[PDB]
Amino acid sequence: PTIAHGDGRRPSKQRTFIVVKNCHKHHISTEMELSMLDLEILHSIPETP
Amino acid sequence: STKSDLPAVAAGVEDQPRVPISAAVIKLGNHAVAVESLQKMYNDTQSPY
Numbered sequence: 001p002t003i004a005h006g007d008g009r010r011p012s013k014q015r016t017f018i019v020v021k022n023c024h025k026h027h028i029s030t031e032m033e034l035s036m037l038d039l040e041i042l043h044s045i046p047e048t049p
Numbered sequence: 050s051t052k053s054d055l056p057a058v059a060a061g062v063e064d065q066p067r068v069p070i071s072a073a074v075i076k077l078g079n080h081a082v083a084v085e086s087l088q089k090m091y092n093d094t095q096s097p098y
Contacts, residue, residue, distance in 0.1 A: 001093060001094055002094050002096075003091070003094050003096055
């Protein structure tokens with residue numbers, strides 16, 4: 001908006017500002033290790049304690 | 050007379066139904082005094098204060 005003033009200065013027309021805001025994408029990585037012998041007995045079901 | 054003139058002097062604003070105005074006030078001695086900040090109403094239009 002504007003103000004009207006009695007002063008001799010020119011009045012200024014209606015004005016709008018159009019503003020663009022942009023994203024930021026961030027990337028996150030973690031790592032895990034698993035033993036082969038550990039993965040071995042998982043499939044079978046145990047019989048002896 | 051003073052009280053006789055009192056209707057005639059306030060031929061206007063007197064006996065108009067009152068509304069609540071939101072504004073900050075202070076108390077100084079025996080006087081309740083209103084306080085205002087008007088930088089909002091001139092910075093939004095980008096005109097000097």
